Design a protein around this ligand. Structure first.
Ligand SMILES: *[C@H](C)[C@H]1/C(=C/c2[nH]c(/C=C3N=C(/C=C4\NC(=O)C(CC)=C4C)C(C)=C\3CCC(=O)O)c(CCC(=O)O)c2C)NC(=O)[C@@H]1C
Ligand SMILES: *[C@H](C)[C@H]1/C(=C/c2[nH]c(/C=C3N=C(/C=C4\NC(=O)C(CC)=C4C)C(C)=C\3CCC(=O)O)c(CCC(=O)O)c2C)NC(=O)[C@@H]1C
Ligand SMILES: CCC1=C(C)/C(=C/C2=NC(=C\c3[nH]c(/C=C4\NC(=O)[C@H](C)[C@H]4CC)c(C)c3CCC(=O)O)/C(CCC(=O)O)=C2C)NC1=O
Ligand SMILES: CCC1=C(C)/C(=C/C2=NC(=C\c3[nH]c(/C=C4\NC(=O)[C@H](C)[C@H]4CC)c(C)c3CCC(=O)O)/C(CCC(=O)O)=C2C)NC1=O
Ligand SMILES: CCC1=C(C)/C(=C/C2=NC(=C\c3[nH]c(/C=C4\NC(=O)[C@H](C)[C@H]4CC)c(C)c3CCC(=O)O)/C(CCC(=O)O)=C2C)NC1=O
Ligand SMILES: CCC1=C(C)/C(=C/C2=NC(=C\c3[nH]c(/C=C4\NC(=O)[C@H](C)[C@H]4CC)c(C)c3CCC(=O)O)/C(CCC(=O)O)=C2C)NC1=O
Ligand SMILES: CCC1=C(C)/C(=C/C2=NC(=C\c3[nH]c(/C=C4\NC(=O)[C@H](C)[C@H]4CC)c(C)c3CCC(=O)O)/C(CCC(=O)O)=C2C)NC1=O
Ligand SMILES: CCC1=C(C)/C(=C/C2=NC(=C\c3[nH]c(/C=C4\NC(=O)[C@H](C)[C@H]4CC)c(C)c3CCC(=O)O)/C(CCC(=O)O)=C2C)NC1=O
Lengths: 161, 160, 96, 161, 160, 160, 160, 161, 160
């Protein structure tokens, strides 16, 4: 629903005004980052299955959670946890290409705290995995897009915890 | 914004954005400042647009100002130009967005009921947007006015 | 094709052309107390405020003064305590 | 509750870094305008009962809202409305002298929207009185302070609506 | 800061702040340029304080870095210089804010329960900031070292 | 095709075409000549890419032409390089259709059972198209390695 | 670099620089803002590259790490992974020069005579670099594939 | 020999590290002035018989170094002296274009102070010549690029003296 | 041409052409039409750029028109226009090739041994062609007078 171009539109809409001078340069600030967000989103989409498989090995394996009793023990749950982590990556590349972090509250963090509390998912192990994921995808996109990617993980990461 | 509906089309099939859509993003952005000066002519001449569009509104359908209708009297005709002001603000958003989804989220998805519950016939409204079509495209060079004409005509097709 | 070894000292032992001949800079690294102090996250934007005011003691319980009554023969120190009784028991102003 | 000094010290604290020159030029920017801030507090505190009274005189009374059927008809609701407008004036000076709108976000804009729905007071007439107030201070405190003063008035209007 | 500490002092009594308190703000900001000049030379000499005040500490008290002590090893000596490096960051924070309150709200609430649990002697960590005081005042001039040294003395005063 | 991706989405919501979708077709038409000539040099190099692809396959994965593999004997490898020719048969209109979906009809929706039903390992033919990946884009221009290599990512990721 | 051999080609004729190669210097320095962006991506994922280029090498030629081979041992691979780690340092030097003489003066000239002496096979270290080429071009997009793979090509064709 | 890119590679090669964020701004300061130096060389070469003309016109002509009791006097020694001044300008074009004075220290400053005592030509007039060449050049090219050309002029004058 | 300078730059070291060098050729093709627009502005405005700038040379150097010098009023100053017209013809040969060598091989290689045998000051030709290209840069634009500016200044530095 809420984009970045729509954000300066909808703030201008409820005033009933038009595109003012401050509303244009903020809108042109999104275009100046336009080559960065497109080129980084091609890089993550080409390396989706490798940025996931490093992030689970960096934080989650060889612990209590991959042993019996842990929440990623069985082959249902460890195959679920890759998919349940891969939605955090794919929607974060939506929020970079949108340029606004409000796509996460519409479609990721809505009932997510109510699920994992009812499921017995360790939220603090999830937020450790996304925090390990945020470092390794900063090395694949460079330091310019690494700040813009690094914001939108920690909008997910504070919605969990 | 085109970056809205190119996400929700990729979110509908649980997919990443295809590189056949990534060049639609990038070529929108680098040509995005072209859309700014198109929209600056709209807000730069909004009083010019609203004056010489409502005159031919009462020439192709000259009976809305007649009594027994809605827009008879000074206050009641002023709600038409109050509602004519509410249209071209969205098409100013519609030029800049690249998609027509600010016009979808604000000003079309209840017009089919909210006007016949108010007393304004849509076939008179659809003339009033196309009366603006003859003057808003005329206030811009026809290369840049061709794609500028390619947004509010969707609203007339969504009225008719 | 060849050059006398005394002549190579004339060519390449200058100040400008010495870094390509032998080692010259030898950078000491960051000392280990500095790299133990970074939060392994060198950049952060909006979530600065998410770690700032949003730590769990809502810095309203350490930022607020209390009122004693040691000064009963003082008069202006009495008057701001009586308002503090009014603004904690009824906790609006009682003026209206 | 922050400051121009505190929200740069603590913002550099939680990053773990020392005082950058970009943080230092923000710190000296507040230090240049300090005589503007301390003089603006004294003028607003002088005629605070007077500076409310023109702002009600333009926007609210001799209308339907003083007439019965309005919200602030009775004398309890009229005297509360001056007091509920006094907080918007007074905490804006605390928002001005700190150089940060975090006074408003912690103890003005916490639950202000739900209280106004629960009481039947119109939000839109309140914020219209604030725009009556934000001009009458600018013709009274001076030119330079009133451009700074109205910004924290607009932080209320960005939150109330 | 003194601006934060005087707003909330005036917020509980719920009136505009007095000119006796406003003049203390005016003396704070007019002396604001000098206190950044105290801090910005300490931050530029950040590495060449902690390496020497650490080496003055272990020479003065050797049982800490000795084996069997807490800070034995190249890792444990390095993390027991960050415990000195963290206080030099807060002292430069307290110099900018003018008061000791960004140290009192950060550094020294529960040190006697922290280092009792961690095993380091609290008497020895108060010796290191005394070595930090004797290093940093030598790197500052004659007049300005007295106002910087009071915040060094409060840190030793909180641990002892 | 890219026109198919728009006019079944507008068919579902019983609507006309949005002009944000219509400029995706307009940018497709201008980029048709850049797209068709990639397939023209793919059709010229038809009997080139397949030859070293088996040499990239069989030197890394020699188990198929070892005794104990499905592609054993010269009759079976002559059909096996013919089956890799079928995937290059599929690819050279993927850079005409603009996107995946004719590969999605004819290449990937039965491949996980049929190669399993024909006794072959599915990873080896998934290796044979990603070993084809390096020797196809390097045989063409440097800018269009992202274009012609885009539909190779679907052929890798569906089998593997 | 381009500039350090456009000098020498102009110095040995004792001429000033022709304006044809002054275009070549001027086009080089405005390409400097994007070539270092390739090198920051390359050094950011060196441990993702070197671990993966080891495992793509040792599956291909398993004789060198099996005992009886030269890289046999727990630590002898750790030098031999380091001996392949050096070519990732030089290719990032060759990326930011736009050239291949920092590859040449550092990692080419006597590389046949080292590994003849130490005993490692000279093609077996070259097959690691093309294994490193397949992962580092998979790190980047299409327009950085040929610009990085050209310097990868020159180190392969010199050693082999 | 080496230039501003080759040296900062060779400064970061012999440490064994990669190109860090402490050496990229050495390249980024070079690439920002990359377009400035190429316009500086193309006005040197168009005026290269006039920069050497105006340099000797302020120092050597009409003096008594070109008297018959003088060093310059025979026209064999004149045309060498313009050419021995040609080779100070042309390499100063090179080091400004390279951004590093290493080409000066290999070929110009090879044995030049020990040739001149072996010949008998004065050194104290040569520093007067190149410092007269410096004030002609910075007026012709521009006060930006005349500053960076003035370093590589005086680097020869540091080596002669 | 810039194609022709590129091959002999690669043939001296016996090499195929670098893909960074083909970027200079591919940029030359897409900017090939712009240089033809540069050249027609010179040939169209030839009769105002020659008689004016030659008169600027005669105002800067009035030695030329006076008897005893090289020129004289009836045709010798007229034939110093056509000997100046040849170089403007050679610049237009040079800018459409993107290369220096059409200025070189027709009108540089033996001009000193020519004009000593002809009895003109070669430096006055260089000051005359400096007066020619001072007004040529102000003719067309400020953008196109820079990369055509790089071929103007070479002939100044070829006469002296
Ligand atoms: C006056 C411009 C408008 C108006 C106001 C009106 N407000 C109130 C009541 C309240 N306002 C507050 C708000 C705050 N109290 C605080 O301490 C702070 C932080 C400093 C804020 C922002 C509260 C808490 C109340 C009332 C709750 C209570 O009384 O317990 C009223 C009174 C409503 C009533 O029914 O008593 C009125 C009338 N009304 C108008 O018509 C003007 C538009
Ligand atoms: C070769 C790289 C791999 C391999 C190939 C192999 N295939 C066959 C026989 C068939 N393969 C197919 C598969 C397709 N045919 C198609 O037209 C398409 C595109 C639409 C596909 C994916 C089919 C239908 C056959 C049957 C014969 C036919 O082509 O119609 C064999 C022979 C097996 C046999 O029993 O005869 C072989 C060896 N096998 C490998 O090991 C490689 C991985
Ligand atoms: C952007 C979203 C949006 C829409 C869709 C909208 C419609 C809209 N049109 C209205 C009135 C009106 N609308 C018209 C309509 C017209 N005048 C004519 O003569 C023509 C026939 C026709 C349009 C070309 C008239 C005459 C009134 C006044 C009706 C009345 O007062 O009863 C009103 C009530 C008065 C008001 O504007 O506050 C609304 C809400 N307002 C919005 O903010
Ligand atoms: C007896 C039942 C009971 C418990 C357990 C309890 C806990 C409790 N922990 C608190 C704070 C806290 N609790 C923690 C603890 C932790 N944070 C971490 O990161 C670690 C994972 C963890 C400890 C190892 C911290 C750090 C605070 C400080 C809040 C602040 O930042 O201001 C607070 C608020 C202030 C305080 O009283 O300290 C309560 C009330 N209260 C109770 O009545
Ligand atoms: C800014 C406020 C702040 C403080 C005060 C702080 C203290 C602090 N010191 C620690 C460790 C430590 N601190 C020391 C320090 C010392 N050992 C000695 O004996 C000397 C007396 C002394 C230094 C002069 C040592 C050795 C450890 C490691 C404890 C251990 O490994 O047993 C730790 C646990 C590991 C770590 O995070 O470093 C904390 C949290 N951290 C903070 O963020
Ligand atoms: C940047 C220029 C540069 C080069 C070329 C270089 C090569 C290099 N490789 C070495 C060793 C080695 N290199 C290898 C390498 C391999 N073994 C294999 O089977 C594989 C084919 C291959 C790598 C994938 C091995 C096993 C040794 C140890 C040789 C021994 O100890 O006998 C050593 C000796 C160890 C040392 O001095 O640190 C050098 C100097 N060093 C440099 O600084
Ligand atoms: C860049 C590398 C390079 C260098 C270093 C170079 C130096 C150079 N300058 C020289 C001579 C000379 N240098 C001067 C010096 C001057 N002219 C004057 O009249 C002034 C007094 C003074 C400078 C202001 C003179 C007069 C000679 C000729 C000496 C002679 O012929 O006896 C000579 C002796 C050549 C000869 O006389 O046959 C050499 C080698 N040539 C080069 O290519
Ligand atoms: C494109 C390569 C090219 C060049 C450059 C060229 C030059 C050229 N310049 C010439 C003459 C001349 N050039 C001049 C020029 C000058 N006298 C002055 O006072 C001025 C300083 C100066 C020029 C501005 C004069 C006076 C003559 C005639 C000389 C004579 O007739 O004795 C002539 C002899 C007559 C003729 O055929 O025009 C040639 C061939 N021919 C070529 O093929």
């Amino acid at each position: 629903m809420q984009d970045a171009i729509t954000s300066v539109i909808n703030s201008s809409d409820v005033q009933g005004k038009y595109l003012d001078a401050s509303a244009i340069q903020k809108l042109k600030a999104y275009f100046a980052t336009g080559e960065l967000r497109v080129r980084a989103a091609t890089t993550i989409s080409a390396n989706a299955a490798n940025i996931v498989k490093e992030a689970v090995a960096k934080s989650l394996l060889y612990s209590d959670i991959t042993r019996p009793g842990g929440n990623m023990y069985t082959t249902r749950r460890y195959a679920a946890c890759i998919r349940d982590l891969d939605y955090y990556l794919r929607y974060a590349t939506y929020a970079m290409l949108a340029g606004d972090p409000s796509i996460l509250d519409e479609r990721v963090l809505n009932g997510l705290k109510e699920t994992y509390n009812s499921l017995g998912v360790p939220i603090g192990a999830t937020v450790q995995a996304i925090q390990a994921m945020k470092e390794v995808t900063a090395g694949l996109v460079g330091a310019d897009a690494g700040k813009e990617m690094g914001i939108y993980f920690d909008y997910i990461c504070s919605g969990l915890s | 914004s085109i970056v809205t509906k190119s996400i929700v089309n990729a979110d509908a099939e649980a997919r990443y954005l295809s590189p056949g859509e990534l060049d639609r993003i990038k070529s929108f952005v680098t040509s995005g400042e072209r859309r700014v000066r198109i929209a600056e002519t709209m807000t730069g001449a909004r009083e010019r647009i609203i004056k010489e569009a409502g005159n031919q509104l009462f020439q192709k359908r000259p009976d809305v100002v007649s009594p027994g209708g809605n827009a008879y009297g000074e206050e009641m005709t002023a709600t038409c130009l109050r509602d004519l002001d509410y249209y071209l603000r969205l098409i100013t958003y519609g030029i800049v967005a690249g998609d027509v989804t600010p016009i979808e989220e604000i000003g079309v998805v209840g017009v089919r009921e909210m006007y016949k519950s108010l007393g304004t016939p849509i076939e008179a409204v659809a003339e009033g947007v196309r009366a603006m079509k003859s003057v808003a495209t005329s206030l811009l060079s026809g290369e840049d006015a061709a794609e500028a004409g390619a947004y509010f005509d969707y609203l007339i097709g969504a009225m008719s | 094709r060849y050059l006398t070894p005394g002549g190579l000292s004339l060519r390449s032992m200058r100040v400008g052309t010495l870094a390509e001949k032998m080692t010259m800079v030898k950078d000491e690294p960051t000392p280990r107390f500095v790299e133990l102090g970074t939060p392994t996250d060198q950049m952060k934007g909006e979530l600065e405020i998410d770690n700032q005011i949003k730590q769990g003691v809502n810095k309203r319980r350490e930022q607020s003064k209390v009122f004693k009554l040691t000064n009963v023969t003082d008069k202006v120190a009495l008057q701001t305590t009586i308002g503090a009784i009014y603004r904690q028991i009824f906790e609006r102003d009682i003026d209206p």
